[PDB]
Write a protein that binds this ligand. Structure first.
Ligand SMILES: [K+]
Ligand SMILES: [K+]
Ligand SMILES: [K+]
Ligand SMILES: [K+]
Ligand SMILES: [K+]
Ligand SMILES: [K+]
Ligand SMILES: [K+]
Ligand SMILES: [K+]
Ligand SMILES: [K+]
Ligand SMILES: [K+]
Ligand SMILES: [Mg+2]
Ligand SMILES: [Mg+2]
Ligand SMILES: [Mg+2]
Ligand SMILES: [Mg+2]
Ligand SMILES: [Mg+2]
Ligand SMILES: [Mg+2]
Ligand SMILES: [Mg+2]
Ligand SMILES: [Mg+2]
Ligand SMILES: [Mg+2]
Ligand SMILES: [Mg+2]
Ligand SMILES: [Mg+2]
Ligand SMILES: [Mg+2]
Ligand SMILES: [Zn+2]
Lengths: 299, 118, 74, 134, 80, 177, 48
RNA sequence: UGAUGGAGGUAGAGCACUGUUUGGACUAGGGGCCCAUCUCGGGUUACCGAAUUCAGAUAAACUCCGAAUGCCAUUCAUUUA
RNA sequence: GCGGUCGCCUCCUAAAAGGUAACGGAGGCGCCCAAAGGUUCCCUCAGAAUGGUUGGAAAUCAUUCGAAGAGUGUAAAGGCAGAAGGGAGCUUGACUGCGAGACCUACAAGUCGAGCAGGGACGAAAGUCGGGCUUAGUGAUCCGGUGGUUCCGCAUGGAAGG
RNA sequence: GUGGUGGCGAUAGCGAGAAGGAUACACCUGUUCCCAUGCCGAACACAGAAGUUAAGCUUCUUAGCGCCGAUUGUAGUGAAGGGUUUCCCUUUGUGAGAGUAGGACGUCGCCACG
RNA sequence: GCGGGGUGGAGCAGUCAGGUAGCUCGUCGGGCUCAUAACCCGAAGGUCGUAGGUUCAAAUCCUGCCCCCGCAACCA
RNA sequence: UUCGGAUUGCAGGCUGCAACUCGCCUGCAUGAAGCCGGAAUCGCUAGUAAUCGCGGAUCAGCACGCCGCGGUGAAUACGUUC
C-alpha cells in the first residue's frame, strides 16, 4: 500500500483503515449471531409449531449466505516477547579493567592505560563516534583481542553475553534451530523461545543464509537471552530491527536485573535503558550519565 | 544358555524365497550352489523333470585345490564345461540363499567365463 | 444414522473350470489373494486373476489350505 | 440378568426351529427342568423362576441357570408410525428351543426338587417337564 | 570393527599398589607412566590402590575391628 | 587375555570334572557381555543421554548403540522411537578384558562393597548385575559426571543351569554375597 | 498443504508431467529425471 | 435331464478365533479385622477376586468345519427346438 | 409437516455363483506419502515368564516360551509371516506411444490386462517396475486460464480469432 | 551310509528318548585379506583345519500333542404331499458337523561321494 | 433429539489464532485500631471436567465419554 | 568462606542420694539457617545513644534475665504543620 505524506500520515491513514475495517467485521458478526440465535430458537421449538419451524429453515438459508460473505479479520502481527533473567547474581565489581592499552598492529594506539571498574546491575554506556574503538573495547573484554598492556578481570560471579555489531555469531549454512542448539535447552524449549521471537513452526528450519538482517538479529538476541548471563555486552542492539521491536528491546533491557555494557547511536534506545555511567571515547572519561552526553557529542 | 541358530536353516529360509522366482527348465536349467565350510558344490537341475543334468564340486579330484575361493573357480569352470558337453549353454543361477559376494561370486564368474550363458 | 452402502463389485469366478478362454481373459475377481495365480496365470493390480495365454482353466488346491488357478493350453 | 456388554446394540429377532443345539442333558445338578416347546424367555421370567425355586428350597442345595438372555429386543412406543429406523432396545431374552435344560438343582430330596421345579415351570411361558440326572 | 567411531583403546598393565599383583588388560584411559612386561614389551601402567587381591573381601580377612559392644565398653570404663 | 587364559587353563578342566562332561564342548563359557544403560532422562534433556553415552563409550571402548522406545508411553512422557537407553555388546577379547577390569578394579571401588548378589539369574544360567552408580570405573574421571547414573551389565553364558553359571563366574572371580 | 504440480522439462520447457507434492514436506521445487517424449530421452524435469 | 470338473462359506453343526456366558478348582491380587506400625510381616472371612484350568452354553455382522440345492463349464451323452 | 437422507468405499441383511429392497443393522471417504513409490539385499512379530540402577504395571537390556494372538498411513471385509510386515543401498516405472483379450454395464462411464515399441531404475543374472496389500479420496458438458503445436487463417502476406 | 536337491495335503509336524560322524555336514580357530555390524568377525564376509559329537544334523524308538480318518446314526435339505401352519409331520433322494473304528513317527525321484 | 457449559473457594479471563495459567472477590497469616469494619504486607489455593489423538509443544485443535443447564419428544 | 556456630555422635568434668524425663561447662566430631531484613514498629538530646567488659542477689548445682559498675564514644535538634 502506497500513501502520500510522511511516516505519521501513513500511521494515521493505516490506523483508521484497520479501525473502520474492524467495525465492519463487528457488524457482520452481530447480524450472523442474530440469525444464529433465531435459528436455534426454531430448532428447539416443538415439532408441532409448523410456522416457527418453517421460518427457522428460511432463516437458516440466510444464515448460510451470511456466513459465506463474512469477512475474516486479519490476524494482527504478533510482537516479540523477551524475558531476560540472569541465572546468578551480580557482584559489586563484575568487571575490572586496569591500565589497558591496545593498538591494532600498524595503527595508532586507541587508548592508553584505560582503567575502569563496573559496579554491578549498572547500565554502562561506551559512547563515542564511528571508528573510535568502541567495538574494539568490547572485543577486548570478551577475549577476541588480547590487551597490549594492562589486565581485564571478570569476577567469578559474572557471566557474560556478547552481541557483536556485524552479526558474526551465526552459521549461514545451518538452520535457525541448529544455530540456537544448546546443551542446556531441550527441543520444545528452543521452539517456544523461537516462537517468542516470531519464528513459527518450520520457520526454524530455514537456513540462516536466506533470512533478512532483522530476522538474523533476533536469533543473535535469542542466543544472548538463552545464556541467562548477568553481564550483557551489547554492541548496537537495535540495528536492523524494525521500530516496534526496538521499543520492545529497550523496555525489556531497562528491567534487566544485571549489568549492561551497551553501545548505541540510537538516542531512543539508550533513554529506555536508563544509562547510569557513560565512558567517552577516544578521550577516556568515566562519567555519570546525563543529557551531558550531548555535550560530549558536541565536543 | 543361548541358542545359536543353524546357519544352514537360515540359508534355506532365504533359499526358498530365491527359488520362488528362480526355477529350472529342460532348456534353461537351474544352477544350484551349495557352500560347505570345507567345500562348494554346483548342480545343473531341471526342476520340471527333477533331475540334475550336470554336477561338479571340490571332491571331483580333478580340482587341484588351493584357497577355497580358487577351488570355487575350478568348480565353476568344471561344471560349465560338463554342462556344455551335455548340451547346456543357458542357465539360471541359483545362489542357494547365499550372498552373491565371495566364493559363490567366484564360482559364478568361472562358469560364465567357461561358457555358461547367464 | 444408517442407510449407506457401496455398489457391489461383482466379484467371484468369471470363468468355469475346464472352460477354454482367450489369453488375457479375467478368471477370478477378488480382494486380496483368495486364490493364487498358477500356470500361465497372472494377477492384476487389484488382485484379479487373468489368463496369460489361451487354454483351459483349472482350479487346483495349492497345498494344504490354498487354492490356485492354472491355464493349460491344448 | 443382563449382559455386561454387547457387540451390537440391536439384533435380529431370529428364528427357533428344532431341538436345542446343546445342553439337552442334566450336567451339574441332580434334577433339571426341560423345555418341551420353543419360546423366548425374558430375564424377568428367568429371575422369577429362580426366586421361586430358591425360596421353596430354603436355600438348601444349589441352583444352576443354564440359559442366559444374550439376545436383545426393541419396541416402538404407542403412537409411533412405522419407519424411521429400528426401535430402541427394550429387554433381554434367551431363545429356548425344546429339549433345553433351563434349570438344574441339587442337594435336596426328590420330592422337594420336584415341587421346586413345578413352581418354576408355572412362572415360565413354556411347557416343561422334570428330568433326572443319568 | 568400524574405524573412527570408537574411543581410543590400548593395552595397559595394572599393578596392585598394596601388593604389587600385576595384570595386563585393555583400557580407554591413558597413563603417562609406562612399564615393561614379560615378552619384553612396554605398555602404559595404571597403578591401583584397591584391586581384587587388596580388597579384604577377596582375601577373606577383614581389617575393621567390628566395634565394641556397650556391655564391654561399660565393663572397661568402670573396671567391672 | 589374562581372563581368557585363566578360563581355558583352570576353569575349563575344573568345570568338566565337577559336572562330568562327556565332551569338552559341554563346557559353559561366557558368550557375550551386554551392558545396558537405561536413561529415561533423555526425554527431559537429550544431553543427559549424550553424556551417558560418552561415559559409557569411555568405559567400554566401543561406541554404544542408542536404543529407542519401541512403543510410545505417556506415563513417562515417552514418544515411540525416542532415543532412550543405550547399550554396548562386548565379545571375545574385549569381553574378557572388561569383565576382568570389572572384577578387579571396578567392583572394590563400590561404596561399602560387600560383594554382588547371588540370586540375580535368569533361571537359564545368565547373570545380570545392576550397577547403582558410575565413578567406579577408572575412566569416568569422577568430576565430568554432572549426573550420577548406574547401569545393568548382562553376562550371557552357555550354561544351561544357574548353578553352572554361578560356579563359572565364581571361578572367574565374582564376589557373590 | 498438498498441491498438484507440473513438472516441466528443463531442456525444451515442455510441461510433460503432472504430479502432486506436500509443500511443507518439500518446500523447494521438485526435480526428477523423467523421459521427455518430445526429446525422446531422459531429462531433468523441474516443477514450475 | 444325466455324467464329469469346478467357484462359493448359507442351513446344520462347532468353539479352533472374536464377542456374550454359567458352575467348579486355584489364585495373582483388592478388601476391612487385630498384632506391628517405620504400616510394617502375619492371620482371617468357604469376604471380593484377575489370569489359568476343568466342565457347560451362545452368535445376522464368530468359524476348526460344512451340506442339500442353485450356479458356471464341457467340441460329452439322450431328448427337444 | 418437523427430524433424517441425497455422490463414493467396507460389512451384515443377501437365502454357500453373481445380483437383490426398506426412513433395515453398523462404520468410513472428499485424503496421505518425495517415501509410506521402484528395485537389490537382509530381517521377523504381539505378548508372557525369569533376572536386572534410576525404574515404579509399564521406559531400556538379556535368556526362554511364543504361528500370529502383532503390523499392514487411513473404515470395514478379504489378504499377507516364502511376506504385501520391518531395515538399509541405489534410484524416480508415481515412465512415453499404446494394447490382443477380458470383467462391468441402459448410456455415459468404471475395472483388469499379457504383449509390442521408445528410453530408463535396481540387480551379477534371472528378472521386477506404467505408484502404494486390495477395494473410497471424486464431478459430464458448456465457458474460461496457462503451455505446446509441421493445423486453419474469409482477395493475397500477416494479424485477429480458432 | 552320507551330502545335495526336488515332487506328493503334517499319514511328511511337534514333544520325548536313544545311537553316529568313515567320508560328508557340522560345530570349531582366527580377522591379513575382499566384505560387516545403525555397537559387537555374534551375524554377514574371508582364511584355516587343533579339538568335539556336546549341540545342530542323520538314524532309530515312542501315539503324549498335532495330522488323516471308514462305517452307523442323526441334524440340515432338493422333490412330492399332509397338518391344528411364528411351527410340525410323511414319502422319496442327498447327507453333514460331532463322536468314533482305525491310520500314521512318511513316501516317490535325481545327483555326488561311499 | 437441539443447543449451551465444565480453568484456584466462588465468579471469570485466556480458546478462535498451539508456546506464558492469570484477574476480581474470597480464604490463611502478619500489620494498623481501645476493638471491629475499611485499609496495608506476605502466602496459599488450579496441572484447565475426564479419557484418547494432531503436534517439537495442547487449557487452546480433533474423538469419545461423564456431568450441569435450557429446549423438544407430535401436529387436522 | 579460615564468616556462622545451630543441630547431632562420641568422650569428659563438676554439683549433688541422684543430670533419663530434666543442669552447666569442656575436648574431639558436624557445620544448620543466616548475604542486613515487607507492611509496620522500639530507645535515645551527651559521657547520652552506640559499643566493650567487670561485680553481685537469688544460689548444692544452673542466666542470653535483673541490679550495679567501669572502658571507648558519636550524629542531630531547622522547627511545632502533622
Ligand atoms: K409353563
Ligand atoms: K469360543
Ligand atoms: K451364520
Ligand atoms: K528402499
Ligand atoms: K567363525
Ligand atoms: K551331535
Ligand atoms: K507323527
Ligand atoms: K539433667
Ligand atoms: K532484624
Ligand atoms: K550460682
Ligand atoms: Mg563498531
Ligand atoms: Mg458391498
Ligand atoms: Mg494400485
Ligand atoms: Mg445356524
Ligand atoms: Mg444364493
Ligand atoms: Mg451371493
Ligand atoms: Mg506398505
Ligand atoms: Mg486473409
Ligand atoms: Mg465326518
Ligand atoms: Mg558473605
Ligand atoms: Mg529529654
Ligand atoms: Mg557504661
Ligand atoms: Zn523435454
Amino acid at each position: 500500500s502506497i500513501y502520500e505524506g510522511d511516516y505519521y500520515t501513513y500511521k494515521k491513514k493505516y490506523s483508521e483503515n484497520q479501525l473502520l475495517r474492524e467495525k465492519m467485521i463487528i457488524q457482520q458478526e452481530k447480524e450472523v449471531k442474530e440469525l444464529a440465535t433465531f435459528v436455534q430458537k426454531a430448532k428447539q421449538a416443538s415439532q408441532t409449531n409448523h410456522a416457527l419451524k418453517r421460518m427457522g429453515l428460511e432463516r437458516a438459508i440466510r444464515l448460510d449466505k451470511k456466513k459465506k460473505n463474512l469477512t475474516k479479520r486479519d490476524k494482527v502481527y504478533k510482537r516479540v516477547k523477551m524475558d531476560i533473567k540472569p541465572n546468578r547474581e551480580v557482584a559489586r565489581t563484575p568487571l575490572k579493567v586496569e591500565n589497558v592499552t591496545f593498538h591494532y598492529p600498524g595503527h595508532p594506539i586507541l587508548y592508553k592505560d584505560l582503567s575502569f571498574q563496573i559496579s554491578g546491575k549498572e547500565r554502562f554506556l561506551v559512547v563515542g563516534e564511528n571508528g573510535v574503538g568502541k567495538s574494539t573495547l568490547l572485543k577486548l573484554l570478551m577475549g577476541i583481542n588480547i590487551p597490549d598492556k594492562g589486565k581485564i578481570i571478570f569476577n567469578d560471579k559474572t557471566d557474560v553475553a556478547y552481541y557483536s555489531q556485524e552479526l558474526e555469531q551465526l552459521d549461514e549454512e545451518k538452520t535457525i534451530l541448529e544455530n540456537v542448539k544448546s546443551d542446556e535447552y531441550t527441543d520444545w524449549k528452543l521452539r517456544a523461545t523461537l516462537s517468542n521471537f516470531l519464528f513459527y513452526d518450520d520457520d526454524v528450519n530455514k537456513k540462516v543464509n536466506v533470512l533478512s538482517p532483522g530476522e538474523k538479529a533476533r536469533i543473535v538476541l535469542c542466543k544472548v537471552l538463552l545464556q541467562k548471563a548477568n553481564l550483557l555486552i551489547l554492541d548496537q542492539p537495535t540495528n536492523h530491527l524494525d521500530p516496534e521491536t526496538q521499543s520492545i528491546i529497550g523496555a525489556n533491557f531497562n528491567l534487566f536485573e544485571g549489568t549492561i555494557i551497551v553501545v548505541s547511536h540510537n538516542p531512543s534506545f539508550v533513554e529506555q535503558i536508563g544509562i547510569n555511567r557513560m565512558l567517552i571515547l577516544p578521550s577516556g572519561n568515566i562519567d555519570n550519565y546525563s543529557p551531558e552526553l550531548l555535550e560530549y557529542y558536541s565536543n | 544358555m543361548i541358542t545359536k541358530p543353524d546357519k544352514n536353516k537360515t540359508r534355506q529360509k532365504r533359499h526358498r524365497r530365491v527359488r520362488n522366482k528362480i526355477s529350472g527348465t529342460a532348456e534353461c536349467p537351474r544352477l544350484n550352489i551349495f557352500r560347505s565350510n570345507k567345500n562348494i558344490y554346483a548342480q545343473v537341475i531341471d526342476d520340471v523333470a527333477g533331475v540334475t543334468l550336470a554336477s561338479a564340486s571340490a571332491l571331483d579330484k580333478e580340482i587341484s585345490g588351493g584357497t577355497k575361493t580358487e577351488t570355487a573357480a575350478a568348480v565353476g569352470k568344471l561344471v560349465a564345461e560338463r554342462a556344455a558337453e551335455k548340451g547346456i549353454k543357458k542357465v539360471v543361477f541359483d545362489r542357494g540363499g547365499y550372498l552373491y559376494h565371495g566364493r559363490v561370486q567366484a564360482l559364478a564368474e568361472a562358469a560364465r567365463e567357461n561358457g555358461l550363458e547367464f | 444414522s444408517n442407510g449407506r452402502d457401496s455398489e457391489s463389485k461383482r466379484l467371484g469366478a468369471k470363468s468355469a473350470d475346464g472352460q477354454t478362454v482367450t489369453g488375457g481373459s479375467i478368471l477370478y475377481r477378488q480382494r486380496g489373494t483368495k486364490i493364487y495365480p498358477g500356470v500361465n496365470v497372472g494377477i492384476g493390480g487389484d488382485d484379479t486373476l487373468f489368463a496369460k495365454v489361451d487354454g483351459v482353466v483349472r482350479f487346483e488346491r495349492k497345498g494344504r489350505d490354498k487354492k490356485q488357478v492354472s491355464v493349460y493350453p491344448v | 440378568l443382563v449382559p455386561k456388554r454387547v457387540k451390537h446394540r440391536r439384533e435380529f429377532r431370529g428364528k427357533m426351529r428344532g431341538e436345542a443345539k446343546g445342553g439337552k442333558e442334566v450336567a451339574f445338578g441332580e434334577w433339571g427342568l426341560q423345555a418341551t416347546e420353543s419360546h423366548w424367555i425374558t430375564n424377568r421370567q428367568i429371575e422369577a423362576a429362580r426366586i421361586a425355586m430358591t425360596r421353596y428350597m430354603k436355600r438348601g442345595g444349589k441352583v444352576w441357570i443354564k440359559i442366559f438372555p444374550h439376545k436383545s429386543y426393541t419396541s416402538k412406543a404407542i403412537g409411533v408410525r412405522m419407519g424411521k429406523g429400528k426401535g430402541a432396545p427394550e429387554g433381554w431374552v434367551s431363545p429356548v428351543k425344546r429339549g433345553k435344560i433351563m434349570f438344574e438343582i441339587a442337594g435336596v430330596p426328590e420330592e422337594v426338587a420336584r415341587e421346586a421345579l413345578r413352581l418354576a415351570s408355572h412362572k415360565l411361558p413354556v411347557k416343561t417337564k422334570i428330568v433326572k440326572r443319568e | 570393527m568400524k574405524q573412527d567411531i570408537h574411543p581410543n583403546y590400548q593395552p595397559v598393565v595394572f599393578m596392585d599398589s598394596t601388593t604389587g599383583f600385576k595384570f595386563l588388560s585393555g583400557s580407554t584411559k591413558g597413563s603417562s607412566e609406562t612399564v615393561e612386561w614379560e615378552d619384553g614389551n612396554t605398555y602404559p601402567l595404571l597403578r591401583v590402590e584397591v584391586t581384587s587381591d587388596s580388597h579384604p573381601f577377596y582375601t577373606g580377612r577383614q581389617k575393621f575391628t567390628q566395634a565394641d559392644g556397650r556391655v564391654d565398653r561399660f565393663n572397661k570404663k568402670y573396671g567391672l | 587375555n589374562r581372563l581368557k587364559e585363566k578360563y581355558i587353563k583352570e576353569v575349563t578342566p575344573s568345570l568338566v570334572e565337577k559336572f562330568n562332561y562327556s565332551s569338552v564342548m559341554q563346557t559353559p563359557k561366557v558368550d557375550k557381555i551386554v551392558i545396558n544403560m537405561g536413561v529415561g532422562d533423555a526425554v527431559s534433556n537429550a544431553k543427559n543421554l549424550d553424556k551417558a553415552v560418552e561415559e559409557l563409550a569411555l568405559i567400554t571402548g566401543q561406541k554404544p548403540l542408542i536404543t529407542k522406545a519401541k512403543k510410545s508411553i505417556a506415563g513417562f512422557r515417552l514418544r515411540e522411537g525416542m532415543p532412550i537407553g543405550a547399550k554396548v555388546t562386548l565379545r571375545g577379547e574385549r569381553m574378557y578384558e572388561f569383565l576382568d577390569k570389572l572384577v578387579t578394579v571396578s567392583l572394590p571401588r563400590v561404596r561399602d562393597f560387600h560383594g554382588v548378589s547371588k540370586k540375580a539369574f535368569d533361571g537359564r544360567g545368565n547373570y545380570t548385575l545392576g550397577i547403582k552408580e558410575q565413578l567406579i570405573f577408572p575412566e569416568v574421571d569422577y568430576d565430568l559426571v554432572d549426573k550420577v547414573r548406574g547401569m545393568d551389565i548382562v553376562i550371557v553364558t552357555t550354561a544351561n543351569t544357574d548353578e553352572e553359571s554361578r560356579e563359572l563366574l565364581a571361578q572367574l572371580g565374582m564376589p557373590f554375597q | 498443504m498438498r498441491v498438484n504440480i507440473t513438472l516441466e522439462c528443463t531442456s525444451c520447457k515442455e510441461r510433460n508431467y503432472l504430479t502432486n507434492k506436500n509443500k511443507r514436506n518439500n518446500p523447494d521445487r521438485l526435480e526428477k529425471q523423467k523421459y521427455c517424449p518430445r526429446e525422446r530421452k531422459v531429462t531433468l524435469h523441474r516443477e514450475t
